[PDB]
Amino acid sequence: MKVLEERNAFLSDYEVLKFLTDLEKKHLWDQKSLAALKKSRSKGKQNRPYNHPELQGITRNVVNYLSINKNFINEKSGISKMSDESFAELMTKLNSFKLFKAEKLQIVNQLPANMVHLYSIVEECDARFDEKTIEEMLEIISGYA
Amino acid sequence: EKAIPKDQRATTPYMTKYERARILGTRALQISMNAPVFVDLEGETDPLRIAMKELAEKKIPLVIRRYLPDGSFEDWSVEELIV
Amino acid sequence: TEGRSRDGGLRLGEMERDCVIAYGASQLLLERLMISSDAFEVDVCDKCGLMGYSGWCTTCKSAENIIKMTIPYAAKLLFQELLSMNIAPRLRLEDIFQQ
Amino acid sequence: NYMSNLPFGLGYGDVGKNHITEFPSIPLPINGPITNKERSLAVKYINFGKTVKDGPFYTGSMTNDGIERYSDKYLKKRKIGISIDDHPYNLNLFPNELYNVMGI
Amino acid sequence: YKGEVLGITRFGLSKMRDSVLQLASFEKTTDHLFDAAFYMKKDAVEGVSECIILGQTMSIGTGSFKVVKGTNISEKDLVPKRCLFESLSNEAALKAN
Amino acid sequence: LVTPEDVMTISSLEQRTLNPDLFLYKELVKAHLGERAASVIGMLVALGRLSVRELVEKIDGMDVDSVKTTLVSLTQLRCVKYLQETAISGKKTTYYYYNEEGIHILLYSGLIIDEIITQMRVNDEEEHKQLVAEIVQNVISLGSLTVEDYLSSVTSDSMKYTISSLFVQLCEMGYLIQISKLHYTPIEDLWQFLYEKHYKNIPRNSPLSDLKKRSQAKMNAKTDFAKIINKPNELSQILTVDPKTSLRIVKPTVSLTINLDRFMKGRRSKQLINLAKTRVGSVTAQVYKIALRLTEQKSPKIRDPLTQTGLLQDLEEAKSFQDEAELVEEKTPGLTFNAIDLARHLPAELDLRGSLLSRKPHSASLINSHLKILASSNFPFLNETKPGVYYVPYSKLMPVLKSSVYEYVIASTLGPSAMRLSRCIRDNKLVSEKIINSTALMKEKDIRSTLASLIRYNSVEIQEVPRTADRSASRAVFLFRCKETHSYNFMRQNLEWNMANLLFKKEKLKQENSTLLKKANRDDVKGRENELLLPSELNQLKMVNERELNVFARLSRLLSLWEVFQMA
Amino acid sequence: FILSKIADLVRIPPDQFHRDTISAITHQLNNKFANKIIPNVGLCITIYDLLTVEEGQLKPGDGSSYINVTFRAVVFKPFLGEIVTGWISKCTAEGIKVSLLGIFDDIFIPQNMLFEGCYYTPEESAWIWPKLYFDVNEKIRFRIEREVFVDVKPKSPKERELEERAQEKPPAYALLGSCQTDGMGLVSWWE
Amino acid sequence: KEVVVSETPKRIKGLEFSALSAADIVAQSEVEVSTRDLFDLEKDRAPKANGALDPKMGVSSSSLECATCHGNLASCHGHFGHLKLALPVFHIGYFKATIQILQGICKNCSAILLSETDKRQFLHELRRPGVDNLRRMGILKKILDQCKKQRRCLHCGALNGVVKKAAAGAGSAALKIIHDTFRWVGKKSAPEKDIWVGEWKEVLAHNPELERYVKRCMDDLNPLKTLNLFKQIKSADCELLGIDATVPSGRPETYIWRYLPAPPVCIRPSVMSNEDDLTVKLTEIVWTSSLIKAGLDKGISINNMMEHWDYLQLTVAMYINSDSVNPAMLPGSKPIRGFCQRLKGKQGRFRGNLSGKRVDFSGRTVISPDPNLSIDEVAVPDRVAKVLTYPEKVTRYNRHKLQELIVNGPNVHPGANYLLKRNEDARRNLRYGDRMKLAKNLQIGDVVERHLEDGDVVLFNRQPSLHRLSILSHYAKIRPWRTFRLNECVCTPYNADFDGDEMNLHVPQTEEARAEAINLMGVKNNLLTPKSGEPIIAATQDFITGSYLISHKDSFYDRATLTQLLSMMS
DNA sequence: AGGAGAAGGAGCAGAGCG
DNA sequence: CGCTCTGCTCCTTCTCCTTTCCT
Ligand SMILES: [Mg+2]
Ligand SMILES: [Zn+2]
Ligand SMILES: [Zn+2]
Ligand SMILES: [Zn+2]
């Protein structure tokens, strides 16, 4: 019952969508089961593994939240439909612009495409750099959507 | 606390009466609480007799942990111990 | 009860439990001497070895170190009588599992 | 009947009820008002007991997160620590066993 | 077995039993319990008498070994995993500092 | 009604079980050092002498390192002793003790600073007061100190003489001694070491008998013990040295500590003055105030010559200590004094002119009158060697001081009828109830009530006398005694417990109210907390500080109360 | 979101022996840690992986396999340098409570740290600025300054009985933030 | 909200014995027993608010409520009270321990009568890594002899004599301790003796009758004086006495009666009313304590007050153990049942209710023979087989047979008696309720309590149980008569002789108990006695004489006789 | 009962003494 | 050299514990 490690590697808001989407794909996918599917499995009429209500509800709420538009703008999120290669190949500009932090996860999902949003993403963002590496980050991290 | 390795084990390889009775009782409990079995049933309802049949056919999925007085132990299965 | 008229249970005495020990039968002793005679659930504190009630310590008013377990009702009664003199039989608990 | 007994100075009305206050009732004359001398004595007592606790010989203890940003940088350090090694120790007064923990 | 001839009486039975519960179960119950209270005798519950009194499982016979059920679980499907992840965090400042 | 649950919170029945010695020492070290020091000190006091591995095995903390750090801190504060002994069969195992006199410095710190400030007579110069206060504060708060460390702990290019000339003045008055291994060594163990090596170098099969050999070892180790004990107490060779073209300056290398014995002697002088003020005039006691201060520096040791703790008392020969005490207290040349000596040190304010009525300029004939008054008083305040010679008989004045303080505590707590009955039974011996009525003239019902209220403490003992073979309480006649030793024993434990309780209450209050002291530390508590608004916070700070000051005042009064019983 | 590492004891009933060992371990783990707060680490969401599984041990009366297992779960716990959106539902004159999307609404962002020119209008007016205000069911942004926990439950049985006769701590996971810098409040303020 | 919760199984590891420190006794209470009236009578014998039967400590019947955790005689575990005493009194369980503590310490300063090196050696001997009770008792006794040998306190130089207890009788003056200070000083002059004679000179002058009683009058240790001495014993020397001073209540002062815990009413229930001895005795305790408290402030006679204080001693002494052989000291007055009497004897707690009990699912009737009964089998009457159910859990392999048993119902022998669903708690009696639909709605996790059938494992027993073959596990066989039947071959292990002999039957109620019974105590597995290894189950008188007559040399059989004999054999 | 255990006495060689 | 301690060794008085239970 003991908690061993308080925090492992930061599970950024990129895999927290893929894992939940795969879980829903494996059991209780509602994108096509709403058509009145009546597949019988194990002879009980349940026809689904893991009827578990609590996990299904919370995973639906997380997938719904990450499917709603990422709220840097007022219609997808920009992370729900993120190609896997994109996360591994848009890393180049983020790493080249040495922010000197671990806020790479902060930008990949929240507040691209604005100046005030990028400014409030990090502290004294104007003071640290205001010459060329604000518009570059905006045009890179906003170029996905 | 540690486990005596498989290559060097110094205990008897003959199953004992106590080990046999405990194995049968535990398996009977497991079956009576609706566990899958691994022998052709024929016509039988008793978990005890199903367990006896499984033991005779050598198909019980349990292992025995033997505790020496110092505190180490060895692991013997039911398909290894003989009678 | 023990009446000839009531549903008087049959006594499994000292000699009989000695025979059953000699056969080496532990679970049968458990069944015949606790389960089918007087099995009682109790709550015991883990920092002090004292039985509580309803998940409450009633000696260190916490309800945070309470553990449930089954003991003979005669054992419960003996512990309460021992506390009624100036004897405090503190019970120490250990985990069954964890190797 | 165990209720027949009764002392002379006691009537039936007084006995039959066990009541021990269990709260103290006889004070000491030392809890009067304060005096200026005792006031200044308390002030120096307060300065003591405080100076030692803020001193090196404490041995008292029986969000430091891992995330790194610029807030951690140029952050005013709360305190400049001290150790057992700092204070000058006369080696004769201490047994040999304890030399390892002190800075030789 | 303890270097001297100890009988099978109550006085002899204080040989190596060291168990207040079973000594009280046998004879001179209150004397033993009061002595255990005074000297703070701190016995362990390992003897068969204490096992019965507390309704625990004996350590002899069928209670002298442990039954264990093999989990039958492979080993290569227990590796840690995170897909296309570690490109950013550590390497964000792996140069110029 | 009050339920048992409410009892455990309001009333102190939880603390009524704790031992007074363990409670007070543990609370003191927890207040001044912390939780690890309290753990180690509590384990030492509860179990006794222990080693480091035993300390690790006992205390939950199994980190030897933590134990070693706690032990070095406790040794620097000299709250512990050590005895590094070697076993003949092999290796050597050190051992640790709890220092009674080390903790009593924490228990007496404010009083110690008070005495050092007042005795230097630096009331004239302000900076002198701050200087001596800082010296004594730093010494007590650091354990041991050197003049080199103190001088390097000041800004350079200054007048080091101003901060060093009083240091030698401190060392010359006995308020500062050098520290050696005898301070960290048990007295009885030292006596055991010295008693041998004198019973071992005896010739084999010597003509002297075994009793004669043991006696020879006793009186041949007593001299070495006395030499070793008196060495650090009074040997001014450290301050006697003098570097060229310089003043009398102490040796840099020697490390200094407080001298608890001198402070205890000063406390005894204060108690004697305050008790004398209750039997003679203020003018007579004014001279007694300076008579006691003159002989204070050379006064005999107060609690013990360290020789009662050193061994078995004797077969019957504590008379060999009583006689030596009388011999020292009289035949000390400093202790003996005449009416001429008191003239010079007499206060300037005192006049002595009209204080005396014969038949019903600081003249020596005035002093002799008051000293004769002191000798004539029922309390042996002074005694005369020869007509004109004077000395204070401590061997006979301490029992009367103890008995008077005890009976006045009884008067202030229980009834004046209780005081009268206690003195009646003490003056008498084995007095029966009828005789109590006869020689006390008080109603028997009231006498019985007060006797019962007095037996709840170890003040009146009952001596049964049975008239039948079976000691029935109907056929027996009951007597009474006083048993002064039991009564003083109970009185000191009660006061010690109450001091422990007060310190515990203060710590609890600070624990509950540290939430404001945090903001106080944030905003520079001294004088600025008004500017931070929060009038509720300021009022709470005010009443908690008032409670703290009251706690300290009551603590000091309790100290003065138990001092006399702590004597022997 | 972060990843943890927790050891535990998991009991597998004989009914589920037919299933895969990992497929039953994950099921009991999900039962235990479905949508619940683990004290002093945050609110767990979902078991992510499984790293250590001991051999199942049986006690003398149950017949089930008791297994020690260590795993890495998915937990929601931002610290300081975070930014979370959402919409506000319920407001009261003690501060403003903004909601998530059906995960938890136990976050309380005070009015005093909300920008500068804001105050509570009891005239049914949403807010006041000295020059724009938000209202219910509109997009917002904020931060968290300090995260607090509460785990108190010392209810004696008599206290339980009296409470039941007469009939608060909903949140065991409470967060507090601020809205000082421009950019928060609402993203549709601009553009 | 919805925090995680955990439940880890736990095992008993060991008992640890001590005494309660009079702060634990108060932490242990819900009320204080102040009055002497059991019932207020203003509400028809409703118990008093602060009396011996105060409802806060539980209820004695099932029609009431316990006012702490509201529950009847069933669901209420029980709660304690406390009972403060006006004057300290001895604890008869710890009386000799109090004597032993006194004999080892100084009676003036309460320092242990040992030397620092001597006590260091004893301490080293006590803490040796391998030391058991026998070695510890030996070392402690040696310490006792050494301190009894010491003559003068090393700290205060006082005088210490023998500290025996005043021995006058079992009941009267038994709990009195006398210190004989001047026993070891003979032909010597000591300050203690001089002070003694100086004290005694005054009394005789005023009272010339005590000249006869000049002797005796030892230093008596009353409970209050003894308590005040024990509060000063240092902690560092508690180990040498037999006390662990590391923990609170590890103290010699906690073995003196100053608070009496008031037992739960569960322990002392009110029968159908009539009270019991424990409650009566504690009412008497409250009575005498209140008398002492009221009289102390009234200045009642010291001779009178000490006579009551001695009476309160014997009252709490007889409530812990009935040992006042001469009860004539009690004006009201040894068959009373104290706490000690509730644990001793053949019929006490240990030998009557803990190591040996009375069990459910058992029967007893006369035995009869049955040759056609196989050995390994016992024949059970149908009448007792219809009441001795075995609880069979529904498990996907017996659902059909279980619902057939439910349909048959308790009336027929192949039937069931109770039903217990998974989610529900109480058992549904099958004597009523249209068992036809219950059998249809039977699910795969319920438990059916069905009659004893052919093949069920049971235990069989005869008394007295000399060797282990007095109880053997058989197989059941339902039969039309009333006796228990067994094959005459297995009569030898029981020592049975069908002359009116009765035997006991037990039906194990769990799978594990069943399997161990049949696999370890089964007749086929116990054909050989373990005292020699020789057969014990074999032929008997007629089974032997018939075999001999068959195999005699004079016996010749044709084919018809041969084949009939073989058919009879099978 | 019998049957050992245990706590207090009572005389006694021993060993040191001036 | 009797005397006088310190210590055995011997002895007397004082409680505990006695079988299957059979409902
Ligand atoms: Mg017969
Ligand atoms: Zn507790
Ligand atoms: Zn209750
Ligand atoms: Zn003493």
Author numbering:
A (entry chain D): 1 to 74, 91 to 161
B (entry chain F): 71 to 153
C (entry chain B): 1051 to 1149
D (entry chain Q): 14 to 75, 101 to 142
E (entry chain A): 1364 to 1460
F (entry chain O): 25 to 384, 447 to 654
G (entry chain G): 2 to 131, 137 to 173, 189 to 212
H (entry chain A): 2 to 273, 280 to 340, 348 to 584
Article excerpt on this structure:
The yeast Ty1 retrotransposon integrates upstream of genes transcribed by RNA polymerase III (Pol III). Pol III transcribes short genes encoding for untranslated RNAs such as transfer RNAs (tRNA), the 5S ribosomal RNA (rRNA) and the U6 spliceosomal RNA. Pol III is composed of 17 subunits that are organized into four architectural units. We report cryo-EM structures of Pol III in complex with IN1, revealing a 16-residue segment at the IN1 C-terminus that contacts Pol III subunits AC40 and AC19, an interaction that we validate by in vivo mutational analysis.
